[PDB]
Amino acid sequence: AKFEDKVDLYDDRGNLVEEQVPLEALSPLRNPAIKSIVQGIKRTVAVNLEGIENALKTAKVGGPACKIMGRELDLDIVGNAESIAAAAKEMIQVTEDDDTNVELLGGGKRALVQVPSARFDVAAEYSAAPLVTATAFVQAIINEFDVSMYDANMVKAAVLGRYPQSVEYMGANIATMLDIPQKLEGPGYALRNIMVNHVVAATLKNTLQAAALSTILEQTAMFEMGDAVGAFERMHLLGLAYQGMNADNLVFDLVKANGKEGTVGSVIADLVERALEDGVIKVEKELTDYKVYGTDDLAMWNAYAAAGLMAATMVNQGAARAAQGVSSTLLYYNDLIEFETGLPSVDFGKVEGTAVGFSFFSHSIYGGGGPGIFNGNHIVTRHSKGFAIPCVAAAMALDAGTQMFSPEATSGLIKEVFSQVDEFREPLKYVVEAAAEIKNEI
Amino acid sequence: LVQVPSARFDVAAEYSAAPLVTATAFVQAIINEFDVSMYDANMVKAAVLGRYPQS
Amino acid sequence: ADKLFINALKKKFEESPEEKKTTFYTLGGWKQSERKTEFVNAGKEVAAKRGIPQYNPDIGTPLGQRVLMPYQVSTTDTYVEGDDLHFVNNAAMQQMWDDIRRTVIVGLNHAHAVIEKRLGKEVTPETITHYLETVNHAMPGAAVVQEHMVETHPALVADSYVKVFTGNDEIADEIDPAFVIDINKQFPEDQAETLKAEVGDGIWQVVRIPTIVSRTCDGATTSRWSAMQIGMSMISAYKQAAGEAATGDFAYAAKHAEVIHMGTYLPVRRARGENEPGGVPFGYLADICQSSRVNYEDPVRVSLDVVATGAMLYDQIWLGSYMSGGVGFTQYATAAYTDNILDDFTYFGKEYVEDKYGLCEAPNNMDTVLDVATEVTFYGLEQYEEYPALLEDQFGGSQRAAVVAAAAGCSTAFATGNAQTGLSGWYLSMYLHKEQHSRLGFYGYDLQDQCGASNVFSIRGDEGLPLELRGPNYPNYAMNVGHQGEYAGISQAPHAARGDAFVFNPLVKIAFADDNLVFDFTNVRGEFAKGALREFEPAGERALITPA
Amino acid sequence: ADKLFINALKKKFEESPEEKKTTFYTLGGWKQSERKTEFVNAGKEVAAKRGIPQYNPDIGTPLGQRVLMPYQVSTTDTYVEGDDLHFVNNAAMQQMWDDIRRTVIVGLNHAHAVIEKRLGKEVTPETITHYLETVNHAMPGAAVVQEHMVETHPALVADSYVKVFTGNDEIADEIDPAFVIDINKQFPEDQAETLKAEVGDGIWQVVRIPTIVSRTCDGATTSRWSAMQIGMSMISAYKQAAGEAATGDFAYAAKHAEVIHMGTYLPVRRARGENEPGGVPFGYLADICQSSRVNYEDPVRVSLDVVATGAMLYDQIWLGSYMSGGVGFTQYATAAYTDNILDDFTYFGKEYVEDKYGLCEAPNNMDTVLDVATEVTFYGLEQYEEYPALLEDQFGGSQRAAVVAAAAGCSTAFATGNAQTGLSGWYLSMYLHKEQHSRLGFYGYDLQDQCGASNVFSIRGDEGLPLELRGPNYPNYAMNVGHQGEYAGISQAPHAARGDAFVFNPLVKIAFADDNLVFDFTNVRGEFAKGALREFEPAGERALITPA
Amino acid sequence: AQYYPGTTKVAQNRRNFCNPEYELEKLREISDEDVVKILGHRAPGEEYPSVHPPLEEMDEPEDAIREMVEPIDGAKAGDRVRYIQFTDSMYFAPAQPYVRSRAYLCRYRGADAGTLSGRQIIETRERDLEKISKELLETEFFDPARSGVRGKSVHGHSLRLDEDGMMFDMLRRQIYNKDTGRVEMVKNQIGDELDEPVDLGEPLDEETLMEKTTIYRVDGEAYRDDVEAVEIMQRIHVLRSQGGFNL
Ligand code: F43
Ligand code: F43
Ligand SMILES: C[C@@H](OP(=O)(O)O)[C@H](NC(=O)/C=C/CCCCSSCCS(=O)(=O)O)C(=O)O
Ligand SMILES: [Cl-]
């Protein structure tokens, strides 16, 4: 009831699910499914029991190529995984009926752990997830085999690595989608420091779900950072709706119209025409054989342009089945649309700027890497406030095997555990349903 | 004295929403109160939150 | 009459500067160069002595198919090959960074209040002088309290010392003048009056630790080393117990409560402690450069001496080694301090503004930004079009973009007297330039420039900041050459036109007005030329403790 | 017969070492010392030159009311005043740190897979040799692709280069031997077998960037500089586009996926980037020292060469300058590498263990800790009681605590073959020492030693770690002298008794087995003595680019 | 679509290069084998190397985006991603660096384009790259004196011409024949010698370079005199500036 806007919401096959939903029913501040995904990502941990066992048997702990000769311990951890995980759960849970979850995967080689919400309710941040999980498994392993006081420190090194000598859990056999609080580029950035490959791994390469998960995480960070407060709130909400949630089926329909033979440029032409048709933009001035367009609603123009940008990525990198060109699309979609129209590009030039440096740092000697190692906290790609990274997730979802540093190489443990969680794997479905459910509370 | 609503922290990873939401609300309110121009408003930001993000 | 860069173009090339054609491929490759010939012979000797191949001109592609050019250091008559301006081969450049890295500013205001209120002892000009004699023995690494201490060799640490300043002239006159930076001697009258009013009765130390220690260790060593020897000297000069509860107050004051670092610490991806180049804000870099107190009737000269200071430090040493390395970024920076090219473009813009508005008299709005930045950008790009030798000299698009926009942004700030509209003019220049030549810089050059317009006047958390407070860690600026040094110039510009004594911190300005520094910050371009000619003598060397 | 420290005590004092009384106050203060005389004379000259008072023997209290002692560098016949072992005055010590700071280990395993799988090109011993010729031109700072590049002076960067190693003998045989660290030449047969088995068919680069750059910049520069020139040499030697999408995989591999830093970055209170002393774990410092591969039939010699390496770096340079500064902590460290005192205590401990249990044959438990650590603690403390000259030599309680506990902890690990029980022995030694003499170290010396016993075997988040993985940023250890270098020795002790080729990382062990380093890591105490005598020739000097 | 504002010949040329319905002028004939030789990625008659298996042999996720977006042929086959790179003289070459990237993403599918002052590059699946590269080499995208095919050592966009009017090339890949007035390619784009050189035809004369160029210059048509094009660039600056402050 703060904003009058309403949107139509669709599924990932292009079918209308719920019409006329108030914009604020998709806000991170109001929608219960966004709250559940965020709290879920804070509390979920993957444990590699096979890796802990192999590190102990070889004494290879504490980082790359590190080994301590004479410290080897041969423990049957995977063979006793059921007993070890149950013992661990007893320490992790606060009460027997709470929302603690501990589930063995891969015949006991892996475990999915979700630490109870009550621990986060009296915590400053999110590090209780890895730290509570790691000590429960260290203690459970020692207790399972009666490991001596003299040898137990090797179990700790196998589970959590070189920490506290290193700042990070260096050499650890546990993993999370978030990274430590010290690595934030600024306050409020934690939901941005989630590797693109981890998002693509958790959503099993489904393009629209990958785009949805990345957009929810990015735009939710924009609220935590204060960017979506006051004058800019509506712009960020419309961005989430049209770029990440396929609002009004605009992304879907632009991909449909341009997928067989289209290019970046053809998607642009379709989006400008659609904006005109809907009354978002109109001719303000005629020059010599050139129309200058204007708008009485910059936030809506930005949203329409952002939907075009996502579709242009899907068409361009989709046709190559190769993610690297997403840096190019992010640049020239915005560059072209400004000279096509006389209106500012997505995020008022910040997507274009992010794309300039992302192109450089994915085709040069100095740093970066392939598209899948970036994220909203990376120095190269933090500049746009939520409108760039979701396209990178879509592009990597569409990649058919051109990358050395693929989700298979960087994110295998995250894939096995985090894809088990339905709200992480298929977020679009849950956020839409929740928005429908609270529609009359707005 | 400012206490930022609990619902903002229910969907945040940590606690920096308190200073960041409070700072931007007061920066925007001051600008709006006196109609501070686009050219000068960055001084209001510096007076509220300091040298951040260089520091 | 002639453009300021014409003489340099005539020195470089046989052709007149307007000619469009030349001859390539018959120059002998590297053999045309005195400097490359020195390197080839040195590579042979190095590989032979150590048993591993090293420099070899036939690896990869063959340099010198075109003329390997001399460069004029701007404002000088010195011409040198570009290799002599690489920071590795230039001791002036290395000493400029050592003099900044090894400096910290440390109040005595909390310390004197501890002595009076907690120890119950008097502080006077005479007790301060006794304290300064003590700390000038101790700071280089020598003892004042314990028996059987072993100490630094005083000749290895001859460049370490402590001085003070204050805005109260009568107090300054009572402290022994060997230890005082005299504001009325170093600054012209109106600037001296402003600076003394800022400092008031405060008393501040400028501490420099040894270059040999700064080189062995890091920037974050400086405020710690300073505080240890301040602490020992407070014990010795004021008769504390040697280690009682009050001793901790002097430690906390000197390390935290009244310390001014040159640079703040950086985030983990580019992790560094204090007093490294990335933490120095553009307003401090402009205030470190001392052109303002000597060239105050020429605001162009003041602004471009700041550009030279910042282009070297931020592009060659910081971006080109701390953040990357190898051959690095010598000519990305030399474009802004060589051949009098930036000088020609910036004097044009200053003259344009003075004739249309009067310096500092233009409305502070977008109409002025559009006027001045467009005019100056068109002037600069026309010079590259009119003189083919100029375009062959500044051969990389990124170099031209930084030079032209620096002139545009400095000129815009000369008109408005405000750095923020200057910065808006910088970004507009880039956008015009990109459309004029259908090219701008290297692959990743305009990340900040496409974010730029929108982030000039933003007030959001990690977006909004006056230009004087921005630096190499402002998010959009953290990665790329050809901006940071120029932004320090734009920060200086409006203040130079206004006649301001400082840009962002008056303590920093006074702290480098000191003739006991090794590098001369009043003439940064002159010093770069002296080091290129191998005539600069740095501190820190180990000759005294190694075989003859 | 004689204890091993008797010769040194006889050279220091006119009295036999057993005598309890002496004469003071009539030695002439600082005038008794050649070195203090040199310093007083230097201070007068320095002060006159610069116009500011500096070193002055009449400030504070008058050094030299007692004998100012010479120190024997253990295992040598070199005797010097302690000022000659200060890191500022000793170029061998500064070059030891530079040689570590400027080194990074960088795989070629992912790089070669990018070539074969993404580019579709071949990698062979021949293409590797061509690549190594290319990178040995580029790495010191010279160009391989672009026209009109300006370059570093080869003689200023003569110490920078790239070598490789691999466990596959046949592949190693095919690469030009100038570029190869030969594992069969540098290590005795059984150690070579182990190391080659650890490496297998992996191929690893050892990259050393120039000392001059490391001194100008910081440790976090090293892996960046390395990566830039690896990236250029991959483009040149394997014919990439000079900048295509695949170029980014080589960058991420060299900077992140297959890099071994010497040190990890530090938290904000002590903010530092990679390759600084506080990030080097004790296990790596033991493996950097190369005593293991030459003195393998003497486990005491190997362990105490590691102590010397770590006491100098961690207490003199790191804690005594990066984390504080001033006169600093020379003799807190020299106690562990002079006068043959730690050697006497540790040879006693090894003989006790050998006779009673057999090396590595004692039960790994608290019973062994209580036996061995107590016996060796009482031996060491009894020497100070029987020889008043020894007590006056190691005059500070902290020095004695570190030396006695290091013997006790090393000897405990000689018995058990396990470092964690050695560490327990170290803490038990401190507790016994404290009760015997009713003192231990300086005001804050045993912060870690009172947390000590309880954190040896803890498994909790910031408490539990095997000693080999601990280092200067382990929370309890982050502040205080007289522990870190001794912990490195205890980490080495069980491995030396076992005859293990390495302590924590086999790549780090091989990477310093290189005769092209400037500092000789096979004989660390030998090099400290050469540096004390002003006979060591460091890299990094600017004499070629300065005036005569 | 309207592509670009402005009333100069330059501005019209910029629009024409972007418009896929504008038929580019063909200026020279090049054989399929000689395109492959100039690229230098494979030898004529060598099978395309693969980076992954053919798409039809793999099991894709069920995905409506994958279903709607037709893969280019080299993607179906699993080809390597390879490149072609050009440098354009500021002395009136027909195409220029931002003109190329803007036009490539209007005309070509599945493209990764990059713009730099001295080099402009496209990366795509190898068999599709070979088809695109024929058009880039045969049409008025290219002049053999004022443009060059260069995968490394690109220096020359900003240098003076030689006495034949050719752009500088450190590795001299393109050689002007005084006897024919034609240019031959004697090396591939990375600089290795070709067994047999490739005819690239005659350089465009001075009047035709002026008619077809997309750079603005004082001795051509200056950008400052295309006032409608300048007006839109200034508009974008102002609206970006206002938008970052408030909406
Ligand atoms: C391999 C790369 C891609 C990579 O990520 N960086 C490179 C190479 C790198 C190397 C080149 C050293 C070598 O020759 O061995 C260094 C010196 C960095 C390092 N490792 O020390 C450099 N670039 Ni580059 N690089 C520069 C330049 C540029 C210009 C050169 C255009 C021209 O027409 O010649 C272009 C970008 C542009 O088109 O805008 C460019 C490209 C490139 N740059 C292309 C190689 C281009 C080609 O194949 O020849 N540099 C410049 O514009 C001037 C300054 C110059 C830098 C050295 C200095 O500042 O003195 C150097 C800075
Ligand atoms: C002022 C302090 C308190 C403070 O925080 N640190 C001091 C002083 C500091 C200064 C002394 C320099 C000078 O004399 O001007 C330095 C050199 C550190 C610096 N700023 O360079 C130092 N201590 Ni202290 N400090 C030392 C030591 C010690 C021993 C000395 C005992 C004695 O019987 O002589 C005692 C602690 C204890 O009792 O255990 C001690 C105390 C003290 N230490 C008492 C002064 C003691 C006195 O009034 O004489 N150090 C030692 O035990 C050996 C090494 C020695 C360090 C220099 C070196 O390592 O070469 C020096 C290390
Ligand atoms: C981006 C990030 O690297 P990472 O992705 O490996 O963390 C970061 N590195 C950088 O920001 C590097 C900055 C300086 C080198 C680049 C300067 S732009 S000038 C060269 C342009 S060209 O001549 O090659 O065309 C670092 O923290 O090391
Ligand atoms: Cl709005």
Ligand SMILES: [Mg+2]
């Ligand atoms: Mg079993």
Ligand SMILES: [Mg+2]
């Ligand atoms: Mg006698």
Ligand SMILES: [Mg+2]
């Ligand atoms: Mg006796």
Ligand SMILES: [Mg+2]
């Ligand atoms: Mg044909």
Ligand code: NA
């Ligand atoms: Na001439």
Ligand code: NA
């Ligand atoms: Na060469």
Ligand code: NA
């Ligand atoms: Na990093």
Ligand code: NA
């Ligand atoms: Na004697």
Ligand code: NA
């Ligand atoms: Na004295």
Ligand code: NA
């Ligand atoms: Na600190």
Ligand code: NA
């Ligand atoms: Na000299």
Ligand SMILES: [Zn+2]
């Ligand atoms: Zn240094």
